Design a binder for this molecule. Structure first.
Ligand code: CA
Ligand code: CA
Ligand code: CA
Ligand code: CA
Lengths: 148, 19
């Protein structure tokens, strides 16, 4: 049953109001960049324009609740998922060596208050290690996620 | 970011498949 239910929309609606600090039911570039800044980032207006402009259907330069709702289900269509999958490697790969090492993966997890045991991280690398290079590359990372 | 918010779902349900 892939039919969307009214109760499920309420579950993401509560989270939706947290990003829109204005309370006007719309997200403005100032509201997103201001909270995005907390993530220790410093993006430019032109960079955010392309991201928001792509999902802007009313051309109002803001994301309205229904525009947001479409993105949430868009995960099933996997339309932008390709962009997030390629972008996520950039955030997970802190060294930028093009390969993610074991020490690097624990760091991003720690900043989010998350932490597992070495055996858990050791086994995870063993299962994802397809080429056997000892490190995870873009090939293994994209291939690991394209599983049925 | 519009796409950044999309990632939350990938690390939520997608990370669950691990166990
Ligand atoms: Ca607003
Ligand atoms: Ca819009
Ligand atoms: Ca690395
Ligand atoms: Ca490998």
């Amino acid at each position: 049953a892939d039919q969307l239910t009214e109760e499920q929309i309420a579950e993401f609606k509560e989270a939706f109001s947290l990003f829109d600090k204005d309370g006007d039911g719309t997200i403005t570039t100032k509201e997103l960049g201001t909270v995005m800044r907390s993530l220790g980032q410093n993006p430019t207006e032109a960079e955010l324009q392309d991201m928001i402009n792509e999902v802007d259907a009313d051309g109002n330069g803001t994301i309205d609740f229904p525009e947001f709702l479409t993105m949430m289900a868009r995960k099933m269509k996997d339309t932008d998922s390709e962009e997030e999958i390629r972008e996520a490697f950039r955030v997970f790969d802190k060294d930028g060596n093009g390969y993610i090492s074991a020490a690097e993966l624990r760091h991003v997890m720690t900043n989010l208050g998350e932490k597992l045991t070495d055996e858990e991280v050791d086994e995870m690398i063993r299962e994802a290690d397809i080429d056997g290079d000892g490190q995870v590359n873009y090939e293994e990372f994209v291939q690991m996620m394209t599983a049925k | 970011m519009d796409v950044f918010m999309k990632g939350l779902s990938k690390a939520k349900e997608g990370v669950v498949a691990a166990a």
